[PDB]
Each structure stands twice: as C-alpha cells, then as structure tokens.
Swiss-Prot record, chain A:
GO terms for cellular component: core mediator complex; mediator complex; nucleoplasm; nucleus; ubiquitin ligase complex. It comes from the Eukaryota. One of its GO terms (molecular function) is ubiquitin protein ligase activity. Its main location: nucleus. Component of the Mediator complex, which is composed of MED1, MED4, MED6, MED7, MED8, MED9, MED10, MED11, MED12, MED13, MED13L, MED14, MED15, MED16, MED17, MED18, MED19, MED20, MED21, MED22, MED23, MED24, MED25, MED26, MED27, MED29, MED30, MED31, CCNC, CDK8 and CDC2L6/CDK11. The MED12, MED13, CCNC and CDK8 subunits form a distinct module termed the CDK8 module. Mediator containing the CDK8 module is less active than Mediator lacking this module in supporting transcriptional activation. GO terms for biological process: positive regulation of transcription elongation by RNA polymerase II; positive regulation of transcription initiation by RNA polymerase II; protein ubiquitination; RNA polymerase II preinitiation complex assembly; somatic stem cell population maintenance. Component of the Mediator complex, a coactivator involved in the regulated transcription of nearly all RNA polymerase II-dependent genes. Mediator functions as a bridge to convey information from gene-specific regulatory proteins to the basal RNA polymerase II transcription machinery. Mediator is recruited to promoters by direct interactions with regulatory proteins and serves as a scaffold for the assembly of a functional preinitiation complex with RNA polymerase II and the general transcription factors. This is Mediator of RNA polymerase II transcription subunit 30. The gene is Med30. Keywords: Acetylation, Activator, Coiled coil, Nucleus, Transcription, Transcription regulation. Belongs to the Mediator complex subunit 30 family. It comes from Mus musculus. It is found in: Nucleus. The keyword Transport does not apply.
Curated annotation (Swiss-Prot), chain B:
GO terms for cellular component: core mediator complex; mediator complex; nucleoplasm; nucleus; ubiquitin ligase complex. It comes from Mus musculus. Pfam families: Med11. Expressed in cochlea. It comes from the Eukaryota. PANTHER family: MEDIATOR OF RNA POLYMERASE II TRANSCRIPTION SUBUNIT 11. GO terms for biological process: positive regulation of transcription elongation by RNA polymerase II; positive regulation of transcription initiation by RNA polymerase II; protein ubiquitination; RNA polymerase II preinitiation complex assembly. Component of the Mediator complex, a coactivator involved in the regulated transcription of nearly all RNA polymerase II-dependent genes. Mediator functions as a bridge to convey information from gene-specific regulatory proteins to the basal RNA polymerase II transcription machinery. Mediator is recruited to promoters by direct interactions with regulatory proteins and serves as a scaffold for the assembly of a functional pre-initiation complex with RNA polymerase II and the general transcription factors. This is Mediator of RNA polymerase II transcription subunit 11. Belongs to the Mediator complex subunit 11 family.
Length: 41, 105
C-alpha cells in the first residue's frame, strides 16, 4: 500500500526530472532561435 | 550569354570552313564535278567567318578602363551562409532534444 505510493512518487519524480532536463534544452533552443533571427538585417 | 555561344559557333564555322576549303582543293586538284560549288561555298564560309570575327572584335568595349562589375553580391552570399548555419544549429538542437526525449520514454 504505502510502498506502492512511495514507488509511484519516486517514478513521478524521476519523470519530472527528465521532463525538466528536456524543457531546459527546449527553452534554450527557443531563446537561441528567437534571438538569432532577431539580429537579421 | 548569347555572345559566348556566338563566338563558339563562329570558331566552329571557321574550322568547318578551313576543312571545306581543304576538301574542295583536294577534290579539284585530284582529277578533272562539284569542285566549283565546293570552292564557292568554302570562300563564302571563310568570308562569313572573317565578318563574324570582325563584328565580334568591333564590340561596344564596355569598360576597358578598370575592373568592371565590382562586387559579386557578397552580402547575399554571407546571408545565405548564415541562414544555412542557423538551419544546421536548429537541426543539431532538435536532434539533441529528440535524443533526450527518447532517453525519457
């Protein structure tokens, strides 16, 4: 019962960590594109 | 554009006229039909090649003073290079994000 809840919480935390790792690169690419296309001309 | 093809055709015609003159002289001096017409055509082609060469030499002489048409759109070349570099960086970042997502799932 409680062990299953703890394991689910650990899995959710790992998934959230991977999600944040992906979002870091996502926002990095967004900033890079939006800042490089702005210096055009 | 068309002047290059014109000069190439003029050179080919000069070569053909030389060949035709040689062949006509050979046929006329071999023994004694169409040698007269052949010699006439060879002379006409030689005169035409000479006229074409004289006309090409008597061109408008665009500049003849300095290096003309200075500037080969280097700005556009650099802009295209930067656009290609942007596309490449976007592709690399997208591949990195895809690898991260694949490692996630």
């Amino acid at each position: 019962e409680r062990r299953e809840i703890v394991e689910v919480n650990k899995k959710l935390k790992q998934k959230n960590q991977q999600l944040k790792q992906i979002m870091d690169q996502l926002r990095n690419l967004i900033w890079d594109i939006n800042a490089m296309l702005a210096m055009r001309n | 554009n068309e002047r290059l093809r014109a000069l190439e055709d003029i050179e080919r015609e000069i070569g053909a006229i030389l060949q035709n003159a040689g062949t006509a002289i050979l046929e006329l001096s071999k023994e004694k039909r169409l040698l007269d017409r052949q010699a006439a055509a060879f002379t006409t082609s030689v005169q035409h090649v000479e006229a074409e060469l004289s006309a090409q030499i008597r061109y408008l002489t665009q500049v003849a003073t300095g290096q003309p048409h200075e500037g080969s759109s280097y700005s556009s070349r650099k802009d295209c290079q930067m656009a290609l570099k942007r596309v490449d960086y976007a592709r690399l970042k997208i591949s990195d994000v895809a690898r991260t997502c694949e490692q996630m799932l």
